[PDB]
């Protein structure tokens, strides 16, 4: 027997079974209703310092696999399911869930009630929390750890996931038949691209390439100065953990790309900060969007389209300067979900295009973009 | 799973191929796999339990008619597959003969061997630690009864002794990421419980009869819809519990608590002590509910209209016969012979040609 | 692993009790257990290869068959257990059944797991490394044959281009503590040789029998010792080839080199491949050897005595009765019969009684 | 594929596969001839330092368990094997070799020619080596280590697995039926022993206790004075690591014992250093004596009898002052395996009467160690 145990701030209580790591995970504890791409969401950086809870019961059927990383690493601060399926069984599958955890010296664990979990996060809002697997958990403890966690409102996390040094990528999208692909060459890819880097994921980059992008991934605190130095015929603003608003240096950078007539394109965090930069407001959700189902309206075309979503933060519509329009709202919530620059050649989205995982719908998001940098090579 | 009657076409192939052979289906739902699966061979109808064996394990020959119910499925495939595990088989065994995904097979194998564990320490070996996770894989009383060699009821009385009930969640299309206020519900061995009994109501429950089969047609749910409508539109609260997912019984808008469960003694008392019916309908949905109707009795279940006693005048032979002859009525000449030459001569008695029911 | 002989007593209850039944035994020597294993099975004398298969995969009744074997074993236990493997059975169903211990029984299982790859990329597949690898576990050149569709010479060659030879350990009696004087040497595939032929001495090498049988007893292992003696005291620098416990033969005293090998193409190609002898003699061993005579010739063999054609002359009947014939000497009438009528003129013409072998 | 690889000082490679951490190992190469005992060779601290190759193909067969540790951790630097079984076959077993290796942080290889090595050892005697476990073992890297290794010669190994302050110990030996007995209550214990920690093994606690003995465990650098204030009934001269020479404190403390007429008995090490503190010389083997099939002769009777040793050096046999007499001779090479003081009641032997793992032979050793005791407290 393998003893876990997660302990929330307000002090309930979830016994379960150890299928990770030993040791303790503490941060926000967060629910995802994808019933697919468990992987993808471990190891996207914007679950940085969050416990994840997922409500699809079974994680784990199919392993898990390279391909399926959207970053080097698993970022999930811990992961907690309702069960761990005796066995993986899928073609692409590398290695099981587990040992892909223990290999990530992940805490995590099965065997809780998820369905109560979700319901408190979703009727009480967001809770910090803890979990120990060990020999023997002790809840006092976990709850200390617990209500000793400074939250994640006012945390500023981009800092903490982008790289040290800036870099090309020019790597396409996975094919059934091919898989990853190989990197292209740079005199291959027509446009060229910085992308700030938030805690960016693969599939982003692997899309914008797909469109031709040659990229230059750089540290989320580059200036302004330092990037317009490299005439970029666009800049995409990453997607990333934590709070938004404590990103002085790139609200600031942003800035000042929204002075030049450079095409400017933000995902998610990027989004938020793409709106912090133009003057509008950000706020913590109650327990904010992660799901792969959600529906969000493109206003402007009166379309819906089902969207893959991780954000514990928003934008203020209220708030909104005139110089941005909204572009689409949550037809879950009404949440502001994409707004575009009046005057400039600016424009984000609250959900991920990308998805990865999640539906596609919302790919196209990035043709805009292209658009835009294209005309603005004419120019 | 679907729902089979071959043995009313006896000269008929019995083997499951491309073109449709089933005449209705039941329906389960679970917190995990094993458990949807338990509770859905529960439900069937077919008197299964869980994985009730096929074969004996000291048939020297039980591994062919293994292979074969593997390699060339029939109805009753499902049970083979523990058959096999119980034989020594292996999952890739299985899975060469079957094509049946792995996935769904260690899940078998590993009842299995919780069946064979639950045989080896008995009921002295069902402790609370034991038996609940036991029901949280879904195991049914009657199923660990037989593995314990002890009565359903024995099972049952433990459970309620170390306080081990089921809990009711809620289906809402999102995962919980929403509140719903409709009451539809299925059972699990989880912490929370949605059920949220009012205590409002006059309440009455009815029952459903499971998976449609010939002769248990939809004749039978809609004469349960009709009690729902009739009642609740009288300001009765109205209860359905029903696992068949082809019918109006079980759409939510039939009532106004939608009990998506196994038409079980089990399932339906669990049901029962949280509830609190004012009156429970056994009489509508044919001969699933009916012949649950004695045990409802006995457990202390509000049944209404037609006792079960008086049920069982009237399907017992001898009761009735006695009860015509009471009211002076005409039945034909009839007899009970037990022998062969027995007949022949009661036969000369009563005179061909004849009606022999088994 | 002993040697039977049941096919000469039909009558005879052929199941192994506590009584013994066998009639000789072979012994092999192998870095590991699978190769030890493996090495006995082709050095039985009983045609097999190793695992090769007892049941079809395609017979319905395999699983009841190979069960009675385990359940009960019989002289042919061990393929039976290899064949449980390819049909599905676990090794905790093989456990049950025959109480072999489980540390041997995955051995097995993984070794048809290996032999089911093979078949699968068939001799495509048979890269250095795998190859290596497949040897390492002590397979037969003949056996990856037959899985990879190819004659076993083409096994042979492939090893000969990838450069795949085993390498000879000696017998010590103390796991390399100390050094020895004595060749008494085994082959496995490894790194160091210790074999150290010399370039000194022209040799004769004589080839055993193998384990002891009915017809192929210590008769035959008498004029290989004979053989090996007189050729030593006369000079020559002598090599046993033989793998009888029980005999003189294998004594290392015997001889000037022993190869305490399987006798067979395989593993005597192998030692002259390293020892180039002056000669081999194939004519003091009994059928085991004698078998082996125009395949070793074919390879290069340096065969002496009477040759392998020779032999054929002798061992084939027609060969023989023309032989005969030319000699002007009498024999018994005698006729091939195909077909049964043609069986019953012939033998008219033959008159009875008859002797008829087939 | 997990490789691992084994490069000895001159420049031999050994390629094989990784069964136990992952990481690298030096240390003194040695081979050890025991068929079964694995895991109590393992655990015995005389190991620090050198990497284990064990002659016998197979390792791993019965698992591990417990009772069949000689101290509280793997002392091996490394383990090299032939072949690691798919499976542990015994009703003892509670873990797996490799998942026990792991978890002890072991670097193993199997998969190698071990008689090549062994013979090798055995002809050129013991080498320094280095053992890599990883993705790519660079061999000039193992090359390196090995070569830069120190040596065994000279180095003081006993300092650094003594135990850190005293202990009591009262437990006795295993059985079948009662497995590992629980300690025995002080007042059970007729006679007190004071045992100095050179790296002893538990069997040799075990079987004095089982002989009357209460035990005070001390560091290998306790004092005589410290010792004879404790009133010990006799003086227990623990097995140990490395080289016996450099242990000054010991010789010096032993010496201060032999003044005296408490009984004294020494074991492997222990049996050195009563032969440097009577004046004797130690050297290091060729290749050593590891094993567990022995012959060592009692001289004054003229009997066999089959022992285990573990032993790399030796007490020099011509050099031997006139006070020391000659009790016990290797069968294999003669070398010397027992010594008595003519004038004292103290005397040691080579090899193992502990056994643990292997023949219970020389047990009785332990035995005319209780006499003099006994006849010690007679005055
Ligand atoms: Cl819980
Ligand atoms: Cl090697
Ligand atoms: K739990
Ligand atoms: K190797």
């Not at chain 2, 119910?69 to 088989?89: M, S, T, V």
């Not at chain 2, 079960?308 to 005048?313: K, L, M, T, V």
Request: glycine letters at 8%.
């Amino acid at each position: 027997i393998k003893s876990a145990l997660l302990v929330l701030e307000d002090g309930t209580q979830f016994h379960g079974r150890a299928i990770g790591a030993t040791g303790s995970a503490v941060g926000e504890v967060v629910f995802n209703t994808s019933m697919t791409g468990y992987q993808e969401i471990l190891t996207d950086p914007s679950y940085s310092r969050q416990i994840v809870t997922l409500t699809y019961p079974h994680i784990g059927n199919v392993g898990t696999n390279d391909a399926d990383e959207e970053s080097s690493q698993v970022h999930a601060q811990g992961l907690v399911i309702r069960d761990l399926p005796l066995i993986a069984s899928n073609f692409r599958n590398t290695e099981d869930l587990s040992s892909y955890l223990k290999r990530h010296n992940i805490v995590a664990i099965a065997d809780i009630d998820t369905r109560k979990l979700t319901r408190l996060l979703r009727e009480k809002g967001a809770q910090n929390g803890c979990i120990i697997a060990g020999d023997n958990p002790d809840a006092a403890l976990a709850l200390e750890k617990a209500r000793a966690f400074p939250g994640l409102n006012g945390m500023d996390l981009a800092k903490e996931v982008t790289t040290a040094e800036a870099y090309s990528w020019t790597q396409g999208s996975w094919t059934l038949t091919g898989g990853l692909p190989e990197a292209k060459k740079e005199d291959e890819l027509p446009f060229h691209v910085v992308a700030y880097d938030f805690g960016a994921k693969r599939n982003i980059l692997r899309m914008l390439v797909d469109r031709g992008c040659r990229l230059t991934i750089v540290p989320a605190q580059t200036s302004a100065e330092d990037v317009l130095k490299m005439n970029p015929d666009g800049i995409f603003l990453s997607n990333g953990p934590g709070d938004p608003a404590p990103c002085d240096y790139a609200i600031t950078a942003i800035q000042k790309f929204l002075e030049t007539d450079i095409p400017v394109f933000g995902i998610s965090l990027g989004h938020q900060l793409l709106a912090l930069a133009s003057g509008a407001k950000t706020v913590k959700m109650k327990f904010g969007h992660h799901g792969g189902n959600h529906p969000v309206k493109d206003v402007e075309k009166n379309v819906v389209m089902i969207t893959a979503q991780n954000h514990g933060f928003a934008v203020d519509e209220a708030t909104l300067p005139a110089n941005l329009r909204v572009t689409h709202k949550s037809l879950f919530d009404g949440t502001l979900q994409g707004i575009h620059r009046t005057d400039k050649p600016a424009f984000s989205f609250q959900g991920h295009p990308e998805a990865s995982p999640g539906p596609h719908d919302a790919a196209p998001l990035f043709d805009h973009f292209i658009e835009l940098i294209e005309q603005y090579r004419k120019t | 799973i679907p729902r089979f009657n071959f043995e009313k076409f006896a000269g008929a192939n019995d083997r499951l191929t491309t073109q449709m052979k089933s005449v209705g289906e039941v329906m389960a739902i679970g917190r995990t796999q094993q458990e949807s699966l338990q509770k859905a061979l529960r439900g069937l109808e077919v008197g299964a339990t869980g994985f009730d064996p096929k074969v004996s394990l000291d048939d020297p020959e039980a591994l062919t008619k293994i292979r074969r119910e593997l390699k060339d499925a029939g109805a009753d495939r499902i049970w083979y597959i523990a058959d096999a595990f119980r034989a020594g088989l292996s999952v890739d065994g299985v899975f060469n003969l079957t094509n049946i995904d792995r996935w769904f097979l260690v899940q078998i194998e590993e009842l299995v061997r919780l069946e064979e564990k639950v045989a080896e320490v008995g009921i002295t070996g069902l402790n609370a630690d034991f038996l609940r996770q036991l029901k949280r894989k879904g195991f049914a009383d009657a199923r660990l009864a037989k593995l314990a060699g002890v009565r359903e009821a024995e099972i049952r009385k433990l459970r309620d002794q170390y306080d081990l009930h089921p809990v009711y969640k809620r289906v809402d299309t999102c995962a919980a990421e929403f509140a719903t206020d409709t009451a539809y519900m299925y059972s699990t061995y989880e912490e929370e419980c949605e059920a949220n009994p009012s205590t409002d109501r006059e309440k009455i429950m009815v029952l459903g009869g499971g998976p449609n089969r010939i002769g248990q047609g939809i004749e039978f749910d809609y004469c349960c819809v009709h009690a729902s409508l009739a009642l609740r539109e009288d300001g009765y609260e109205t209860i359905m519990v029903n696992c068949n997912p082809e019918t109006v019984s079980t759409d939510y808008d039939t009532s106004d608590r939608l009990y998506f469960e196994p038409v079980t003694l089990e399932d339906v008392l669990e049901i029962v002590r949280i509830e609190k019916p004012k009156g429970v309908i056994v009489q509508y949905g044919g001969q699933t509910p009916l012949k649950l109707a004695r045990a409802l009795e006995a457990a202390g279940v509000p049944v209404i209209g037609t006792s079960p006693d008086a049920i069982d005048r009237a399907e017992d032979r001898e009761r009735f016969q006695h009860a015509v002859e009471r009211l002076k009525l005409k039945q034909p000449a009839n007899a009970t012979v037990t022998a062969i030459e027995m007949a022949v001569e009661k036969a000369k008695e009563i005179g061909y040609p004849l009606v022999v029911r088994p």
